[PDB]
Amino acid sequence: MADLSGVALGRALDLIGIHGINPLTGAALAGTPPKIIDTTNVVELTTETLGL
Amino acid sequence: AVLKTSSFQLPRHLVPGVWQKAQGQSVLARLSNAEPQEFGEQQYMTLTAPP
C-alpha cells in the first residue's frame, strides 16, 4: 500500500494534463480546464488506416 | 536331394538393446521453476485493485 500511493500520485498528472478527469471517480474536472486532447489536430482511424 | 539349412529350422539371433520412439518432455518443468513446498494446499496473496 505504501508503494501504491506514490504511483497513484504520479499517474494523476497524465489524467489531469491529457484528459481533464479526476482519477478517483473518472469524471471530468468541473471548470472545463485546458486539456491536451482539446486540440483540433485529430487523425481519426478508419478501417483502412487502422493497422498502419 | 541336396542338404539345405531349410531342414535345420535354425533360431534367429537376438540383437541387444530396444528401439524406441522418443517422448515429448514437460514444458511446465522448464518454463516455471519448481518452488519448495510442504505437503498441502498453498495460499498466495494477490492485489485485486490499486488506490
Q: Is B33 helix (H, G, I), strand (E, B) or coil?
A: coil
Dihedrals phi, psi of A29, to nearest 5 degrees = -65, 140
B11 touches A at CB < 8 Å: no
Are B51 and A10 in contact by the 8 Å Cβ rule? The answer is: no
d(CA B3, CA A1): 96
As a dihedral over the C-alpha atoms of residue A5, residue A7, residue A10, residue A11, rounded to 10 degrees, the angle is -110
Chain A residues 23-42 with CB within 8 Å of chain B: none
d(CA A40, CA A50): 20
Which residues have CB under 8 Å from B23's CB, separation 6+? none
Residue closest to A37 by CA, chosen among A25, A48, A21, A52: A21
Cell numbers 486540440 correspond to A39
For this PDB entry, the determination method is cryo-EM
Beta bridge partners of A21: A28
Cell numbers 487523425 correspond to A43
A47 touches B at CB < 8 Å: no
